[PDB]
Design a protein around this ligand. Structure first.
Ligand SMILES: Nc1ncnc2c1ncn2[C@@H]1O[C@H](COP(=O)(O)OP(=O)(O)NP(=O)(O)O)[C@@H](O)[C@H]1O
Ligand SMILES: [Mg+2]
Length: 268
């Protein structure tokens, strides 16, 4: 089942670009309302990758995950998604230093809610970073980019990668680097890095370090420090996400609960 090209209107300007091609803003005529959308436009593996991305998104339904409207094929093969007007979380915080810690807590908590749902759904994101969190409003975040995502088999709690590819190593847990094992707990490690990025206002983690130097740092039990003005309770949570041993590392249910309670304590 596909979208009708005649019901899609594209704006010529591009929101982004990838190896696949470009991302463009558009409008899709729904039953009555016209919906603003973001469209990934493919320019053979590139097509297989986008189709696998669509296959994952088709199965997800959560307020904190970017929804796929559908696939459209006419002059080009297209992946139609809902539009997150404010763009990537890292770029937004870089340009909006006035954002309060309470607001950052709210957004990272929303990411933890989407990840809690992903974990329950038995999918591993594998690219959970601040650049992949898209903002609908300054108070509404959604997880995007299911390009490296995997639906875990009914009998396993991890996805085993064959060989090391183009990996975002700085966001990867030690078992990913060492055993090529990807689980919801490895996404928890990435979520810790994402939290650090968010409280650092979109600064890059492990500044000026090579991937191998990051692995060597973590193996010595060393971790990134507390970002300037970051609540200590949030830094403690990042360190819990960065638990070396996968078995002792918390899952998204524990992480979301810790975040939820801390946010409501701040509200109180
Ligand atoms: N659903 C969406 N809503 C709003 N903007 C989007 C959406 N999807 C993608 N974009 C924009 O397009 C950019 C690139 O898309 P992305 O999913 O990151 O693909 P990519 O292959 O990783 N390209 P790049 O980030 O440059 O390495 C994002 O950083 C957003 O600015
Ligand atoms: Mg990208």
């Amino acid at each position: 089942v596909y979208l009708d090209r005649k019901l899609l209107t594209l704006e010529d300007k591009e929101l982004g670009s990838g190896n696949f091609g470009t991302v463009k803003k558009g409008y899709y005529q729904m039953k009555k309302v016209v919906k603003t959308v973001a469209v990934k436009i493919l320019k053979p593996a590139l097509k297989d990758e986008l189709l696998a991305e669509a296959n994952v998104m088709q199965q997800l339904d959560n307020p904190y995950i970017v929804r796929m409207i559908g696939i459209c094929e006419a002059e080009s093969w297209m992946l139609v998604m809902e539009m997150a007007e404010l763009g990537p979380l890292n770029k937004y915080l870089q340009q909006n230093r006035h954002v309060k810690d309470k607001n950052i807590i709210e957004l990272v908590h929303q990411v933890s809610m989407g990840m809690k749902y992903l974990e329950e759904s038995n999918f591993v994101h594998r690219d959970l970073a601040a650049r992949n969190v898209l903002l609908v409003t300054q108070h509404y975040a959604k997880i995007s980019d299911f390009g490296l995502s995997k639906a875990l088999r009914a009998d396993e709690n991890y996805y085993k990668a064959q060989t090391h590819g183009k990996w975002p190593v700085k966001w990867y847990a030690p078992e990913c680097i060492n055993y090529y094992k990807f689980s919801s707990k490895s996404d928890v490690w990435s979520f810790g890095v994402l939290m650090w990025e968010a409280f650092s206002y979109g600064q890059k983690p492990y500044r000026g370090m090579k991937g191998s130097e990051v692995t060597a740092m973590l193996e010595k039990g060393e971790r990134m420090g507390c970002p300037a003005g970051c609540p200590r309770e949030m830094y403690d949570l990042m360190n819990l996400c960065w638990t070396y041993d996968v078995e002792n590392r918390p899952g998204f249910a524990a992480v979301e609960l810790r975040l939820r309670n801390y946010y409501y304590d701040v509200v109180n």
